[PDB]
Amino acid sequence: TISQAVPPVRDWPAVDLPGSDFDPVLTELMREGPVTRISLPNGEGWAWLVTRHDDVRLVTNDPRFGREAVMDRQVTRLAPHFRPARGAVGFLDPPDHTRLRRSVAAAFTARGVERVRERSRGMLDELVDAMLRAGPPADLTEAVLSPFPIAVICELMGVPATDRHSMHTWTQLILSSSHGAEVSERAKNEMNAYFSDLIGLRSDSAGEDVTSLLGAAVGRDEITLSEAVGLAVLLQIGGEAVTNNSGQMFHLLLSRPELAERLRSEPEIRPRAIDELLRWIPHRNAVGLSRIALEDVEIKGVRIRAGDAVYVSYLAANRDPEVFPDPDRIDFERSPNPHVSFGFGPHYCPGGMLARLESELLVDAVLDRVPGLKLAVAPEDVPFKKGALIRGPEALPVTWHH
Numbered sequence: 001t002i003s004q005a006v007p008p009v010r011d012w013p014a015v016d017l018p019g020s021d022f023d024p025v026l027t028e029l030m031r032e033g034p035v036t037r038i039s040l041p042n043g044e045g046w047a048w049l050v051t052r053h054d055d056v057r058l059v060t061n062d063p064r065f066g067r068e069a070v071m072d073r074q075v076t077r078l079a080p081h082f083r084p085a086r087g088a089v090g091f092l093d094p095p096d097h098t099r100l101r102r103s104v105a106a107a108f109t110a111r112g113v114e115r116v117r118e119r120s121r122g123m124l125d126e127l128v129d130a131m132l133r134a135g136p137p138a139d140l141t142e143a144v145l146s147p148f149p150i151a152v153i154c155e156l157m158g159v160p161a162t163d164r165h166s167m168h169t170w171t172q173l174i175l176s177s178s179h180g181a182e183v184s185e186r187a188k189n190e191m192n193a194y195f196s197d198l199i200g201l202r203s204d205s206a207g208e209d210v211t212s213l214l215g216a217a218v219g220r221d222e223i224t225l226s227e228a229v230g231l232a233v234l235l236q237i238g239g240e241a242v243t244n245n246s247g248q249m250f251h252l253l254l255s256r257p258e259l260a261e262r263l264r265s266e267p268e269i270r271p272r273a274i275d276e277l278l279r280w281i282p283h284r285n286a287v288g289l290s291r292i293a294l295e296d297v298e299i300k301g302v303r304i305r306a307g308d309a310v311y312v313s314y315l316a317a318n319r320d321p322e323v324f325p326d327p328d329r330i331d332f333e334r335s336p337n338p339h340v341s342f343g344f345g346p347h348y349c350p351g352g353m354l355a356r357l358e359s360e361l362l363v364d365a366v367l368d369r370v371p372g373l374k375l376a377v378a379p380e381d382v383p384f385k386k387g388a389l390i391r392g393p394e395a396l397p398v399t400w401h402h
């Protein structure tokens with residue numbers, strides 16, 4: 001009937017945001033309408049953006065949107081660099097995506113990750129023992145939040161004990177140290193070779209650790225060795241997400257003492273509280289990886305054309321006022337909490353249950369074992385990551401009673 005003009009293309013420059021402050025450009029986009037168009041610093045052209053919870057679920061779960069097609073051009077994006085390997089799980093669609101996710105799914109369910117909870121709680125107690133022994137102050141990130149997710153994933157992956165410190169080092173060197181280009185990709189090569197060998201060796205394993213599952217799937221020709229190794233590396237270095245996210249968690253718990261006080265007074269609410277924190281924390285800068293409309297799709301009266309790129313903002317979806325009344329309020333009692341901090345659809349985060357487990361153990365040890373714990377700097381003086389994809393502290397200086 002009546003033409004509905006397309007939205008203006010909104011430029012979305014890379015900006016370093018303080019602490020956990022919400023992106024005001026994303027707020028602007030949320031206020032503009034459910035369907036907007038954006039231009040990011042890198043790649044070319046524009047992309048659709050959806051911000052409402054229902055539209056985000058549609059775009060991420062509907063078969064009419066595809067990931068492989070994203071590598072057919074230079075879609076506008078935040079990251080300077082793009083498309084490493086084209087076997088990367090992120091860029092696969094259900095001809096092949098499903099095989100790869102299925103091969104390890106069992107280790108990452110609630111029941112799957114529960115298998116490493118006691119060992120993980122022990123490893124965390126070791127780290128905290130050491131921090132207490134050294135005495136205050138400490139950088140909680142360096143002392144605890146950084147090493148713990150790596151220890152846990154080593155255990156879940158089934159890395160032989162004598163190789164786990166090599167794993168730590170490799171993980172630290174990969175894309176997150178200094179010595180750009182060279183040491184990172186050499187560490188990546190070593191880790192690749194390592195997992196190629198371990199998974200290869202486990203070609204007929206009935207083990208239930210992740211590398212055994214990968215090895216067995218490779219052995220039954222469900223996936224190739226190359227696919228298995230790539231995924232193994234992604235999973236192995238994925239814990240940095242928990243390091244960053246839990247860093248924001250404790251930054252919040254310490255800068256807003258009432259939250260910490262609630263979790264000490266009512267320990268029973270900690271799982272729900274963690275979910276609320278996961279909902280609220282602005283985990284990333286801007287948006288991540290788009291999907292291509294494989295056929296024309298109408299969203300809120302807007303015609304998304306086949307070939308167009310479409311982004312979702314999980315961050316925005318987690319502040320959807322209809323789904324989350326008073327969305328900017330951190331409410332640990334929040335009634336239903338259907339957040340999409342771990343994404344949605346086939347590409348939903350494999351590590352979500354693992355991240356909740358890690359966060360629950362972390363909150364327990366840090367809130368229960370550090371007497372008089374507080375920030376050692378003003379909240380606004382905690383350094384947060386600049387030029388980042390995933391937001392979070394560079395360091396989290398804390399102090400307490402020795």
Ligand code: HEM
Binds near residue numbers: 242343
């Ligand atoms: C609280 C911490 C974490 C958060 C907030 C998080 C969030 C996310 C999000 C938003 C996505 C994208 C979903 C999409 O493409 O639509 C994702 C993907 C992914 N995450 Fe995480 N993640 C976390 C921890 C982890 C950990 C610890 C691991 C490693 C076990 C991991 C492994 C992955 C993988 C492999 C993918 C790609 C999945 C696929 O495309 O099939 N994540 N994550």
